[PDB]
Amino acid sequence: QLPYSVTLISMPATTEGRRGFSVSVESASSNYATTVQVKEVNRMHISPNNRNAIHPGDRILEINGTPVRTLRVEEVEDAISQTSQTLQLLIEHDP
């Protein structure tokens, strides 16, 4: 009924604490990330090209090409917080 949009972005390496967003990770079974949802966004910490590509309520489907349901909760958060690494994200936009 409503549009379903998916965006692939690449976030360049930055300094510690400045990835530009946080997540809420729900882990239904075991310690795997079932769903990864963007919680907060600091637009000024995001490069101009990606500043309008990630919003609160968006869900992260894949991190650097890996579906998040196969990652442990710590691996998801490590990837976001390891600002020395380029971070590729597959983002499902919320309608």
Residue numbers in the entry: 145 to 239
Please give the exact wording used by the authors of the publication that reports this structure:
These protein kinases phosphorylate the actin depolymerizing factor cofilin to suppress filament severing, and are key nodes between Rho GTPase cascades and actin. LIMKs across species have a common architecture, with two N-terminal tandem-zinc finger LIM domains followed by a PDZ domain, a predicted unstructured region enriched in serine, proline and glycine residues, and a C-terminal kinase domain.
The crystal structure revealed a compact globular domain resembling a partially open barrel that is typical of the PDZ fold. Unusually for a charged residue, we found Arg163 in a similar orientation. This arrangement seems to provide a rigid anchor for the C-terminus of the αB helix.
